[PDB]
Structure formats: structure tokens, C-alpha cells
Amino acid sequence: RCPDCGSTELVEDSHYSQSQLVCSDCGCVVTEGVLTTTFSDEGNLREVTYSRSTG
Amino acid sequence: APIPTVEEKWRLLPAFLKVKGLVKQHIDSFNYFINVEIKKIMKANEKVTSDADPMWYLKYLNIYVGLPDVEESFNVTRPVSPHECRLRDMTYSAPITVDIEYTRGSQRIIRNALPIGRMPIMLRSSNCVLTGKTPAEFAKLNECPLDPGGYFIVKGVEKVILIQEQLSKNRIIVEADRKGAVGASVTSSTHEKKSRTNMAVKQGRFYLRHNTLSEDIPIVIIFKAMGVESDQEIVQMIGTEEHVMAAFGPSLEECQKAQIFTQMQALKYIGNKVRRQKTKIEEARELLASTILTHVPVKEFNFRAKCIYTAVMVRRVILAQGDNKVDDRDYYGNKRLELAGQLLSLLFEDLFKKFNSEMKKIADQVIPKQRAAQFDVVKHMRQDQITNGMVNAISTGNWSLKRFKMDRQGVTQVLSRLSYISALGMMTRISSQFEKTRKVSGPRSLQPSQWGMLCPSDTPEGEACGLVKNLALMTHITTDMEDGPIVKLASNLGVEDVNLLCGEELSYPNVFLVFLNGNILGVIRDHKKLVNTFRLMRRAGYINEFVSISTNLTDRCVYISSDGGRLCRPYIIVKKQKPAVTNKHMEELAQGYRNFEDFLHESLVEYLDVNEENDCNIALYEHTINKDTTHLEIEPFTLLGVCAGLIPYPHHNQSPRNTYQCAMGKQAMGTIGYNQRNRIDTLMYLLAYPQKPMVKTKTIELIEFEKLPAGQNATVAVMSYSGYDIEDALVLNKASLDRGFGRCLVYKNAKCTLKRYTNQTFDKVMGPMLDAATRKPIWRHEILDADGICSPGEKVENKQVLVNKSMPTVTQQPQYKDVPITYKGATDSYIEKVMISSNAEDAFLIKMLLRQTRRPEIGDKFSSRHGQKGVCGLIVPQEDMPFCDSGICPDIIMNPHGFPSRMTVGKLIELLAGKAGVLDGRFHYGTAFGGSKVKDVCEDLVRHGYNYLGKDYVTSGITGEPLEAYIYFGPVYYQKLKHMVLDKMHARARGPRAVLTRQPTEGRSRDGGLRLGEMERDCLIGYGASMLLLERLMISSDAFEVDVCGQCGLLGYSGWCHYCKSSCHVSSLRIPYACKLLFQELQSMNIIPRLKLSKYN
Amino acid sequence: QPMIYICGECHTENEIKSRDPIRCRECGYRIMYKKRTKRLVVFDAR
Amino acid sequence: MIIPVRCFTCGKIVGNKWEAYLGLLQAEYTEGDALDALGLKRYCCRRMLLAHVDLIEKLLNYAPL
Amino acid sequence: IVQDEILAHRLGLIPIHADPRLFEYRNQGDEEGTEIDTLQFRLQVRCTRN
Amino acid sequence: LILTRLLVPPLCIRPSVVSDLKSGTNEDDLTMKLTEIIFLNDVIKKHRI
């Protein structure tokens, strides 16, 4: 929601190669930047299932 | 009195292309694999049985591959076209079945049709549906008739198996070691084992080194162990020359130092030197008979042939220890080319052996304890094993054969669909065995042995320069023969048995050794008669035309090569200063009385190998024929490959220019085929108005490139204008680009899958989320249809969904979360088609073909078919372009300064020929080492009233005054490249970061930022800008604020130190996030960095 | 709502609903394209 | 794919003279005399008509229809 | 089979015999067009078997 | 210099990716090595008991 006015009309829109949350009423952002994994590590990481990781 | 010349001689080239040539190699190899080799592999493992419960067996009778089909239907096969396999993202394979007989309960049961696997079918093969079809039937199957084929289609992608190049097996190689010692090596490889044994002279004596021995042993001990015990016989076998005995003296002395004088003592010594895998004597004898020199066969423990072989090897080493006659590895006469056929044969053999082993294990596990219910193999004939093996080996490209210990990578590559020339050139590629292991520069160089076999100029510019090559226009790869009649003719031609005489005859100057695929065939005298008779018998037809025979007078060895993979080239036989081919034969060939096979049978044209042509004399032209001539070159321009054939007048240009031109033509933009509209690929570049070149080579007519051009002819004027073409740049006309010149189309693919999971739930597409305020879909869901799928014909903008995909989160009511396929793109795209298909897994595959129409602008890279790559510097209007007396304004203005440094006279010749052609309505030829001369085009120009040098009177368009110097106008065939400024333009905001290290990503498609490498840091250090470097590498990249405790020096969190359980000494500190990651990793490695903080003052 | 599609060889207008096996009458081809939209689209001659 | 309407260099209408040119190919006229009779004095239109490849019918052979 | 953008580009290159002096320049925007500064040409061709 | 305890690093060095497309995940090699080490410790304890 909006921290100042309290408007809950926050919309997800893609910027110029940037993701953030912004309200359409006052144009104020509440959370900018997103953390995503790289494919350089994706091929190195190994898979783990629930059954094998529970016993 | 000039020698008469056959003008129509070049007509021998197309006829050959009717039976062989560019793409026929892989097709014939795959046909031989699926028709002959597979049956031999099945016969080699026809019977498989288990040790337990004897009298049980599984006998294979005959294996069939059938026609390609698809298992989409429920337990029903259906003929499927390769285009349908491309669309449905499936494989184009045929069911491999086999008929067998087995024993269930000692009652023999026979099966006549039992499928066991699926073999991917190469296109245009014998069993492929595309062969034997007319262009109309190709249109009915949505396949281009001009498509070269020969590539596999797996999971919807087109993979091509490159021709592998390796060293010839079973051959002695004399080479220098790291310390300068000139030793020998032999890699004996049979159908079962491969072993490389070496011999060195490190201490004046010859030591033999093998992987199965603990320490290298003297050669004289091995001689004594192999039957021959007298030292005199050993010396006679080595050689009778004084220097030979002087060199072999130390070996005899070292042997006499020990007490080894009999075969038993030598065998005991070897067994003592034998590594673990009298018993030692038997193991030594077995290693000497089977493991060492596998290619040399012993009848019944008779090492006479092996003794002669090692004696000849020692003699060659002694002769090489003097004059530095060291053999070279880059000599292509000792190279072998493995096609896809041999690789697929080895892979199928390995897979069949694994399947038989698995079946035997299952039998041993099931039969002895299950029940009175008799076990049968049919209930365990796994059909997915071979299929999955083939699919993975073709798709991933990594081949791991444990039975042969072969670990190869990059065998299969994605077929490049940039243009027709791109695929046609990638189909005839050849990779090296080195694969960039070291910058040797030896094999990367251009060896003279590549004459007529591989294209000299065609090579990828970059790190792979010299390791990836292309075959010539007229070349052929030989196959394996039976080798029976060769041995029979050699024995009948007077070749005495090597076992009948001692090795002393090997030291005679007139006695020449005859070999056979590395095996000592025997000795002979007057080898000239032998070679002449063998060549005459091969020409007569009693011996296969691919069997090569060569003679080395330095080593005095007659090599007879009959193994496959050797490169051969056709040559016209010349006898007594006159070629056998006359004008009458060429007239009969043109009229259809005879074909190339008739030329082969009538002793007119014969195939020559590199080793064979090493001893023969070839003439380039008829006027070059002298008394000592044996063959005549068919056509010189056949030296170039497929890509290099596109170069008009390549003999007038520089070699780096030709290399760059081939590299850019492999990336040239143009039409792909007649089915380019129904084809849906991940990236396709098409030209709006493609035009065939005015100066076309004969190779272009041979490869039918004129039917599918990849460029346009524009009136280029070579001059300097406005200074916007300083370095390689070019100026384009605004009106030309406005009237359709250079207009291009980019087709991209967007694929989505709706698959069913383990639970009884499926991915479903929701309808467009209509806005209740306006009763219309939202801007994001505007292009969606009623079914939630975007409809063709509309325009797609950035941040717009194409398929409103929603997937369940469970795998009680299902909970669906939205994962729509959004369109990432700077510019708008138009939907041409939306294909919806259904696989056997009930997964709906939706493919949208987005289209973008792009106009040439500043930044687009253009080529001029001469390696003169350029970028559009300025787009001036039509009025600003200069005009001639006729009123023609140029479309492209190129810098003349690029001509002196590169010496591209071929471009000027092509321009003049094209101008003459467009004046007289003709197509001039830019054939290599020939073509239309300058005098002819000059006469054509002077006849039509134009200047005989291309330069015309031109008035400046800007000032309206005539120029002091004439401008060189003419039509040039310019081709646009795929390198666009729109796709290469990139800008990076703050954006996302990586989870491990909080830094921007790498690639542009991943929204990545630029990397200030080590060299950039070095430059910034040299400049001395400390604050700029700090802002770039710390503030703007991975800035973070950590909490460090001033007592223990460890890292805290939220102003608290868990180590000391206090927070009074904890202070904040700015730091790169990578540095904190390094500190944490070091603390994980027990290397604890203790930070002692202090005030900044 | 009647959703229409076009097969790959007979090119006949076939009406199928959601969660149906992609097929076509009087044939067995399994390539189903979507018809062009009826909405107005503006193009520039540049 | 198809014959362009305008010439790249000058801009003379040339799309209307394509099929007629094909007729001149169906007749006994060569390339040069046909391009002369069509009224193409400058060599740019001659190159436009001569170097053009007719690929529209090859694509229509693969059209849905 | 011809692309929509290529079709529009080909149609744009087609000259019109209309007298330009009797018309005026279209103002900025106004995609609807007025009687003075625009002309409409309808092209509807349906190909079928003979 | 002789280790008796192993310092397993935080999750910042060992990123975990939730691959919802299949029935699995993505964990780095350090997690697998630590899992194998703990498994070996448990096996040694079981053999001692």
C-alpha cells in the first residue's frame, strides 16, 4: 500500500530492465529491485527432491 | 603449334555433382550405415546367452529400420514429414525392429516383428520420405526442393554431425621429443583395443615404452623374447650399414651386460616388468603377442612379422637420427576423415552391447528363482534404451563410449539457418582433433596437402582459425574395401614372403618394402613395374578405383592404402603428352551418350589420393603439359569451397579479404528456401526484394544460389562524400531506402507448453481479463482473443502477454497462479501465425511467429561480397547525392581509401563486369582463374557509349558544379548482414542482481550490465582517478553496509555480534558485497580475517 | 463461444472447444492454426 | 519475392513492366532488346528487371490455399 | 502471402493521379482525416477457382 | 590445524532456486558435500554402535 496516503493501488510494471512496485496515484515506489538467479550458477546447482531430503 | 585444348572440359564437373559432391557424402555414409554396417553389427552380436541355466539363448535373425513414423497415435504408426517434426518439436526417426528366436521353457519361440528402438533418419537418405520426390511433391510435404538435407531432426531442432578429422592409425611416426630426442611412436588400433607404444633413444640405446610395462626395456630383450635369439640375425634385420651398426652397438652392449640370452630369460624379465592387471612368462608372451602391436597379426605365436616390423622401425629411427627427416603431423596424406556413418556405427554397437549385457543380467536375476513360469526376454525388451541413447547423443553432442574409452564433445552442432549459403557451407565443415588444446600454429597453418581437397580461403575468423575447414567443390571421401583381391594381386605380382628371407634383404638399396594399411605386406624388386601394373589393373576395373598406392624413395616403402576416410580427387589421365579425354568424349557427355562412370571405366578419369598424387605429376592447363606429366587438372576454380565460390574474381583480391568475405557470407541475410513461410524457427532473417548477382560464378549456377539470392545489386559510386565514410563506412541514399532498398524482415518464435502433471490437473489458459469500467480488455490483455491466445494480424508492444498461461500450485481445490508469456522487445512486433499442436503427452504446444519489418538506418552492417564490411555512417537525401548526365544517383557511396591497403582489384573488376552486363543485358562470370576479361567489358562499355574505365562525368548535387575528378560508378552486389544496431543497442539501469554476488547480470537478454574488466581497472589506475574507480567498482556495483565488531574483528548483523554477545563495539562499514562474500567464504575455509577498525582521521 | 481453427492440409474451418484432442475431420493432421483477427489494424506506408 | 514498384536509384515505375517483360521472354526477344523496347534507357532499370528473381509463385506453391 | 508491412510499403509507392494543388497538408495528428486533406481508395480482391 | 568442527556457510553463499517446473530444486555443490559429510558421520557412528 501507499505509506503516505494509504492507497492500495500498487501496480507491477516493467521499467527499463528493472522491476519495481509503484502506486498509480502518487507515483511513489514501495519496493524496487528484484533478486534473480543467474544461469551461470543454474547449471552448477544440483536438484533435491522432498522425499530424498526427508528420509 | 599450340597444344589443342578441350573447351568443354569443365562439363566434367556438373556430371560428377550428379552422383557425388557437396551433400552426397553424408547421405551415402548414412545409407551404408543403415543398409550394410547395421547388419554386420547385428551379426557380430547375433547370439546372447547367460551362464546360469544353460541351453537358454537369444538369437537375432535380421534387423530392419523401416520408414520414419510417429508414435503420436495410440499404438499406431503414421507417416510424418520432416516439417511436421520441426513444427511439433519431435524427432524424425524410424522404428528399428528385429526378428528373433529364443527359448522360454526349452520350447523355441520365434518372433517375426518386435520393435527394439528408434533410429533418427537423416534427411534425403535411402529410407527418408524426401528422396525420390518431385518439387511438386516437396511442396505437398512443405519442404524446399533446393534444401541440401543430410541433417538430423531431433526434438524439433536440426543437428548436423561435422566430419571428424584424426591421425591415420597403425602408422609409424618418427618425431622429436621434448628434450630433442628423435623417437618413434605407433598407435596400433584394432576393432577391440587401442595401444600407443613408443621407442626412444634417450641414452644412445633404444628403449620400448608401453602402458602395460612398469619400466621401458631395451629393444634387444624384446627381440630375444620374440623368438629370434641370435644377435647376428637381429643386426641383419636392423641394417647392414656401418652407421647403423655403430648406432646399434650400445644396445647390443647393454644387452650383453645382463645375462639375457634366451627367449625364456627375456620373457621372465618382461614379466617381472609387467604391471598387474610361470605365470609371468605367460603374461609377458600374451602382452607381446596380443597387446603390443595389435595391428601386426601373429598366426600361431609366430612373431616373425612383428620382429620384421620392429626392425624396420628401428632402422627408420636410425636413419632419422642423422639427417633431420622428421615426419610432420600436418601432412594430410596421413589424415583420416570419419563421417556420421562410422560414428553412428560405433554408437549403435556400444548401445547394442549394453542392451545385451542388461538383458543377460536380467535373465541371470529372474530365471533361477522366480517361479515355474518360464522367463522370456520379450517381457523385458526395453525399447526406450537405444532410442534415448541416440536422441541424447545427437542432441547434447557429447559421445562417451566406455568400450573404446572415447570421450568426445561438440560432435553435433545446430544447423545455421541464417541463409541458404550458411547451411550449404556448414554441411561440409570439418573439425580438427586438437579442438583448441594449444596454439600450436602447425595444424592451424595452410598446408600444401590441402590442394583440391579442402578450401584454402574458407575458414572461420577468430579463435577457431585453422581448426575448422571446408571441403573443396570437387572432392570425395573413400570407404572401406574388402582388401582380398588387393592381397591376391600383390601375391601374384611377385611379392616374396617376408618369412622366407632374413632382414638383411631389407638393407639392400634396390629392395623396396610393400605395406598394406600399416601391415608389412612384403618385399619387392623394381617397384616401378609393380606400381605401373597395379595402377593399370585399377584402371581396368579389377581393383577398386579408391585403392591408393604410393612410393617413398627416401624410406624405400611402397604404401598400399585401402581404408576408408581418405580424400581422393578426380584427374584426367595423361599419356604421352596428350590427355585421354578428347572433344568427342565431351560432346558425347553433353549429348548424354556417357556419364562420369563411363569416364571412370574407360580409363579416362581416375581418383588420386594425397599420397598417390605425391608421386604423380599434375598439369594445371593443357599448355603446361610437358613430357613428364601423368594427370591433368579438371578445373582450377574447384580449389575453392562453397562459400569462396561466391567471390567474384577471387584471384584479384587478398586472402584475408576472401576469408572475411566467407565469414560474412556464412552470416549473410537472404532467403532460406521455398518453404520459408511455413517454417517456424527461433530466429529468421529475410530480404524484401532479393536480387541475383550480375557477376555470378559457375559455382553459383552449380549450387543454384541464383534461385535463392542473399543480397541486392545497387549502383555504388566509389568516392568520398561529406566525410561520413572515413574508415570502412558507407553513405546510403534516403530515397533508395524509402523505395524498398535494403528492407528486411525479422521473424522470431515464441513457444509455450501446457503440460499435464502427475496429478489429474492440467495447465489452462484463462480468457482476457476484461475491465469492468469500460467492458473491454486491459492494455496488457488487449491482443488476446476469446481463448486467451493472441490472434495473428495485430501488433504487439512491450510488456504485453501472448498466452495467458496459468499453472496449478499443488503439483483440495486446485490453486492456479498466472505465468503469462510476456513479450520482451524494444520495438513493436506483428503476429504472422499462431500454431497449436498436441503431442502424445497431452501437452498443448503454442508457437507464435512474430514479424518485424526493419529499414536500413545508422548502425546496420553491410557487406559488398569482397570482405569490405561497413557500417552506414550517414543517410543523405536524394538531392544531396551526386548525379551523372543521365540523372542516376548512387545508392551506396563507399570509401576509396580502403582499396590501396587491401588491394581489392577484384571489386573493381566485378563492378566493371556488372556495368557491362547491365548495359548489354548479359551476366558476366567471375570464375576463379578465368572468367570475363577486362578487354571484353571495356569493348562492351565503349560500344554502348559509356567510358571504357567506369569513370563518368558527374556533377555535384550540393553545389551544382561538376567535380574535378570523375567518379567510379557501377552496380555492385551488396549484401546486408544480420548484425543490426537495434539488436545490439543496450542500456542498463540499476536493474536486478545475482543472488550469489549482488552484481548486474552478464547477457543483454538477461538485462545485464557492462563489465569493467581487469584492463579497464588498469587504465583507471594509470589515469590516477581514485574517486572514479571507487564509484564504479564499489559505489555503483556492489555497495553494502555491514556491521563489524571492534573487539573480535568478525562480521555482525543488525548492530549485534553473536560471537561476543555484545553490541557496544559493533560499527557500520561500507564494503563491496563481493568482499563480504570473500570474507564469509574464507571464514568457511578456517581462514578467519580479523578486521581491526579505526577512525577515518 | 464458437472458437474456430484451420487445419494444415485441408484448410477447413473447424470448431473445437477447450481440452479437446487437436485433430481435424476427414483427415488426421494435427497442425491447427488460428484464423486472422477481425479487429482493425493501422499500418504506415513508411 | 516480388518485383518492386519503384526503382532503388531513380524511382521509375517498373512493377508494371514485369509481366510484359515475361511476355518478351515468352516471345523470341532476348534480354537486351526487350529491356530496350520496354523503354529502359538507363542501366538501373535494366539491372532492376534483369537481376530480379520471381519467387512469388514458389511461395504460392507452398501457400495454404 | 505477402506481408502486411510490405504490402503497405508497395501501396505507398503507387502514384496517384490526383492534383496536389487542390488539396492541403494534413495538420499534426488528425488520423481521421477531413474532406479537404485526404483521399480514400478501397481495395477488395477475393481470389477463387474458375 | 586439525579440524573437529566444520563451519557450514550461510545461505548467501549457497543460493537455493525453487524450480517449480519439475519436482525438484537447485542447490549448490557445497550443500551436497555437507550432506555427504553428515551422512558419513552418521554411518561411522552407526558402525561404532
Ligand SMILES: [Zn+2]
Ligand atoms: Zn502516495
Ligand SMILES: [Zn+2]
Ligand atoms: Zn565481537
Ligand SMILES: [Zn+2]
Ligand atoms: Zn484437415
Ligand SMILES: [Zn+2]
Ligand atoms: Zn531505375
